[model samples]
Target: ATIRPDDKAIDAAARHYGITLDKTARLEWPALIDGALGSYDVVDQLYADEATPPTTSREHAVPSASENPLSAWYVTTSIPPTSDGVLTGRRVAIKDNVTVAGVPMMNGSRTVEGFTPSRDATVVTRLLAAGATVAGKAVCEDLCFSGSSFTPASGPVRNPWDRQREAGGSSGGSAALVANGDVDFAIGGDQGGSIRIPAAFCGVVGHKPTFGLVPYTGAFPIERTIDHLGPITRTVHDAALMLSVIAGRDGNDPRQADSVEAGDYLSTLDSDVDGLRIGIVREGFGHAVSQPEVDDAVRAAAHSLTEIGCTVEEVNIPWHLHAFHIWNVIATDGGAYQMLDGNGYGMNAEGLYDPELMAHFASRRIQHADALSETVKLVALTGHHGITTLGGASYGKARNLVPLARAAYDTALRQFDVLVMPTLPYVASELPAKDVDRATFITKALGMIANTAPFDVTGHPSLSVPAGLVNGLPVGMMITGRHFDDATVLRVGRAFEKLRGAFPTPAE
Candidate 1:
């Protein structure tokens, strides 16, 4: 049995952080998580009473049933991937957004707090069948909508890099667990770079497959236009290996391809890069928040890639800047309104979010309706310009932009196997305050624009790999490829992983 907390240790920790037990005791689930996590309560009580709070040699977190619900968290599903013959020694942590039989899918919000589906999401079922273990349901931003790791429904998902900073979301928890070696690899969903952002911040690997590459039997659908499911891990090979199991035909998902051919991702791990083509979007090198340190790290990574017999070229794909306006409309009108858990479901108001992400999400919301309409007007004003119909801030227009975006990506693919860019503009910065929100919406939106959203827009395969660290924070390099060409990106990712040496480690 667990030893009870002694009052003396409890009081000491409380005094250290400058809070009292009564005040700490009042916080609900999220606060309870931090309290028990740090053994703060026990430490406070121990100081008040007599003995010290018991210490454990264990470095990482384990499931805390008293404070967290079984329904809310899991590492892996029940079945082992070894049940199949192929995947022999792989382990996986699943996102709460993915479905498992007899388990509920909350998407990190109270709106569907108690919804358990009858079947496993294709990704989870396939992973188990391929001999992988379901690790745990990592925490996520409420509804996976917001950019800040802190969620109204759930507490902030701390960055292992720096506990005080934010881990980019909505895949924040999933990436944090994998980055910290809580598991081998994990599954993450991306509508607007959810997987990529956290991967960048936490110094892990994340891949967003082309639209409809993986089946989504029970994963929450954020938008018919821009939704996607993918994998997150510490190694590129792990990402490819996991994707091989989950990608293919499924009768349940209409998006699942007909007459599927399993991708040769694992085989591509050894693919030669003697003369592989690489492109650098000059614009990505110098964006709004692309801090000098971030730029230096990205430049060094690109130089290393070039040294390895890859031909690097500077290229311009101009429409990327306009993608922001296009996504704002899709984000607000498509389904963001329905995703709220009441009027104040997320930190939508200025004073309630991380400063960086607050500006990002807010600029889009305030001008969302107008920006979307202007995109339509621009398309119409320009006389066709490739997309189909244009109207309100609905997904219809965003969906229509897909073909054009794909065309642009295809052009890049024709020129280069991978297009490289800085994953986010800068390393995670300290927020002003919880109550004194700075600007996140715009920051998050801009960061994703250069890093993630375009891949979702183009239905292309995109991956973010940890490049290096600057100012004691991790920075990432993004690689994007043609649609259904996930293998190409994964091949290079495996190589980069070897070069970069990214792997899960217990919390430092």
Candidate 2:
């Protein structure tokens, strides 16, 4: 286990650390380095990591175009429940980025096509423990990077309502499958509104739980600070029920920093929507890219809250306009360092590390790197330059700015019980052609997150409920609540759902 550093090796090392070594210094360092490295050989032999794959592997089958017309499913499974507890016979669709042991996880990218996870992601185990069946792994946008369905390496996840259009992504498949009645529940990851964005576009309920409320162990991570996983269900009750099962500390995720409380989300579902003050964020409306019909639909939905004795008024969170600015540097530079260069799990985090998966991903990086979607490449380019050339100051400054943005939302919550806005500024757009240009592809993938992405940075509980139809496409009204108070957010969502009665589903 001796690393004999030669002349070129020493030169490379010096350059890597931004130092200059003389020719004589390089020659003298090899034996010194070899002796210095000799002590670590025993350390390697003495230690072993926990690569705990499942006791039994399930057989997974990839679906064909005929079987999966919407291109939403990557692979289908029949994992039975381990318990007869809460979830009893409910079927769940897991996004491809989450681990479902023994099933091939492509993560919607060709780079990870043949890799099977060693263990169930924390949520998967919790689902089985609560008697829910693992139905399958739904397709996700490549590396879970895009906000539109078309960026997956396999192909676009077609909206069920309109085959030519998108199902908002990177959780697009989960939303599409739920809308198609393929599963009763689905697990979605939201770093930058992946969960809520798709639910908004496909007309289902999506919840972005407060950050750190759920363990992120065994999933492919983009960035530690912003990662979240929550339910994408057809009903608010279903979302609450699923949260009851999956929310808790596992002692494995670095994301869960302290003693976090997972409250009985279902108990608060019936909390009186009557007399609760609803703040309709003035800044949330009237975006330059926002369609008037979409804004009007949300406005109408907010006004309907008054029917149940809820007070609705316009409230401004001026910082709402600046939240995305803080998010950009973090997601771009931080994502580049953590996800791209750090191999999906960044450094300086105390969590269960998956070196095997990292190696597998790193191995294919050269051959299949061209398959990277436009947004993924954008993060890499910007982050690399910002980190290398600019001394990595931007990401730290961005992280510091998070508290200011979060306080703005928290200040608004002081007066208003919950804040309401349009989940997305518009509805799903048509999927770009296979040969579409890079500009159009990137814009379509990222443009929709202006409203949904900010809350991810702030770690606020945000839910998307279908508002109404606009030009026959669905619009989403967002309900946001205080940190760790997911119940109130779900409560508002439930009340809104009750007011709307039945939301429209995609037709056959």
Candidate 3:
């Protein structure tokens, strides 16, 4: 715990910065640097004494392999509800990335394996207050980076539909647990299709609430701009119910504005979907990665709404095809800089910061660098190279360019109440072998995110509803709406569920 650096240490730092420091100047600067670094100690006692909310939750353990056959649970906890409310009698699974005081949270990686938060995330508090008992912590992809389930340190989250295939990710376990009736519903976080991708693959309902509708205070995040925490459930109506419970600003996440009014999400459900206008973005289909069967199922799913009086027409939003390009730059730079290099919690934010998590990540990330998944490894190398070489100009430009992309969606949204597309270009694919090549592994993890990532950046509410089966595997129909119009999105999804009738649970 010394703030002092020796001459050689300082010289090495200077070399990293590509600056030449004369011997005398180097000798002079070390003490100055020490003084500057040491100055931060003034706030040490303040943070040291920062009070964590009182928690009486103690019952918890890692479940047995037999009990957790799908490897959906990271840890099992029985935190009782604070009081009875709308969510009374409901058991809920929390994605591991969220904080639950006293519960160990590895976030599907070894980097934060030994760390347990002393404070409850805002959403966790809300759920307990609403009378939802936490069933357990669900597994998520390593570093919450991969779009496939196999990367979790616990084990691959097997698809309930087909045990041999991926459940999709990084919220794969959340979706899988919900589909299997392990919990009434689950709280899941999404940045790039983590919730929806798994929901689609596992035959469940996942909603990425309008950006900032749900507080992200306790969740591990990829980027603040794209970070979202919402619900993954077995039914569209249940998704609305969970959203109603967790959707609101806690004044902690900078992502949520003062104007973020948590509305009655349940009101829109069961309402007639007869007059809803659905815009199917033409570019959303026919991607090189898109399988014809999956795309056909989604199109037919959209058209089935016509049986209920909804109009289905294709809308040309050419930018829809280009959103992934914008998301890559932002997600890559932001994820690498803030998630990896920034030590999990980035700097200069008004929201609550987890100093302990940061310290753990800073240390363990180095010691456990080899434990990082191939997806994160790809991000680390490519993102770091691009960011450092371009001096973050690309990140800034892509961030700025988001408005144009949003405008593209907004313009089309004006002509239609909601947009429809395939949640993924393909259905759940088989998991790669343990010895699979890095290139193939990375592709499986990152390829299906093109449609979902766009809404994350544009701040739209997107819901992935189970479309139907394709060769015994499930497909998802994505329903996206204007910002904060989650109610309408849920309405449309519910309407389709009615038309489609009871969706079959995983028989295999």
Candidate 4:
């Protein structure tokens, strides 16, 4: 699309700076401008495509009923792994937000209609290389903007444990499929507890790795700083196995720094928790909105750690109670600015720009504004107002407070291997009425993320494991560790799973 820039648009730009293009300069400017633009394509040509393309034949998948009584898959297809590795013979579902070449990544939104990616997400590439089967693209919440399942344009993703209740979002489909035994594991995104919330609601084990531990190269960004991708599975060992395959450096995502290294997460799966210190975060417990049963279950989990010969103690991080507010400022402002500027493609490098997102944003202002979900529109409006009034000073202050929260946890980690808390204050609440009040509906959509959102800001590895069944529904115990210390968190989760046998699935 590059062309010699000798046009009215160029003249208009020059006019803004009070420059008048002479006849001689006008003739020469076109060649110089065109040459600069042409070089950008050369940059794109440098990277190799799919270093390890799938060797196994891809098959068209057919949807089938699961615990939820409807197809969880948005697209049904199988891409076999190129070779055998840790995950050989495992079936995995790729969340629709994450791209798989040749599949339509709906992102639970009609806005991205008819768009299919030409390349695979780094996680998809790694999973295939490790011999995992890509079962299909699972459902995600609308543009991954909601924390509850009902907001998806596709329709509500039912909780595998109880169809009447809501599955937590935006990774509800990933959690539902895994919880229903339709897949061995699934890859899910977490910006503000998307992975952990649904994992808790659907009774699956979801691990949100330390930010940047897993390359988010092809996953759409809600906000790059807080965005994470991790495994959702039925067991801690399965989650760890998936993490081992997918966690590492992939050169494509520039947001990944050099310090983000891969680990042998599977090696410590059987490690005993004897002598390990576990801290039960006091702030995450006893909240008014948190159900008594949920609190009791996580407390039991803490006690179980003590029974396993681990030292369990209560630790207080007072700022944790305010984490949701802090996250709102940064994520809303950052994500809004991104969407308003260029549908978030502005965050990526020139060559890594997402064409689908670019096209989606091209008409966002003119035609697609009304089509956006409440979450998206709310964030955009609030973000616009905040940035306009304060010039993003509040966003800066919120980011500055991140290290303080991280340091508070690090101080406790000096005495504890990991921190334990209830993944949500309450178990899955019933879906709101279709015509529920807007403010109340929004509250229901986000009320459950209180305990999980803090870690997204602090860059901690947080895992939500099903602790026990509360009133026949599941409750999750969350374990968080120091940044990049994901192995210890997995070890703790595995110990808990051993303490309480296999987690039971819903009798749908």
Q: What is the C-alpha lDDT of each candidate?
A: 0.65, 0.89, 0.90, 0.83
Q: Against the true structure, whose TM-score is highest?
A: 3
Indicate the residue-level lDDT of 162 in model 1.
79
**Model 4 per-residue lDDT tens digits across residues 229-302:** 99999899898888988989887777678787888788878988899989999998988776987898789878
- Which digits, one per residue and each the tens of the lDDT, describe model 1 over residues 404-479? 7668768877998888888788886653244543244334423444557766766678899888888878888889
After TM-score superposition, the amount by which residue 165's alpha carbon in candidate 4 deviates from its true location, in angstroms, is 1.0
Question: Model 2 over residues 1-508: C-alpha lDDT tens digits?
Answer: 6346677877898899988877788767887887787776655545343334436568888887798999999999989999987899789999999988888898998878889877789999999999999999999999999999998988899888788888999899999999989999899999989999999999999999999998888889998889999999999999999999999999999888688879889987977788899999999999988798899989999999999999999998989989988888888898889887888887787778877688788787667888888889998898999899987898889888899999999999999999999999998888888899998888888988888888999999999988888988888999999988899999989998988898878873
Off by over 4 Å in 1: 1-62, 65-86, 337-397, 436-449, 501-508
What stretches of model 4 exceed 4 Å from their correct place? 2-68, 348-351, 364-366
Candidate 3 global TM-score:
0.97
RMSD of each: 17.1, 1.9, 1.5, 4.0
- Summing lDDT over every window of 10 consecutive residues in candidate 3, give the lowest-scoring window: 48-57
Count of residue pairs whose backbone atoms collide, per candidate: 50, 1, 0, 0
- Judged by lDDT relative to the true structure, which candidate is superior, 3 or 4? 3
Report lDDT (Cα) of residue 336, candidate 3: 94
Candidate 1 local Cα displacement, residue 441, angstroms: 6.5
TM-score of each model, paired residue for residue = 0.72, 0.96, 0.97, 0.89
Off by over 4 Å in 3: 1-8, 50-57
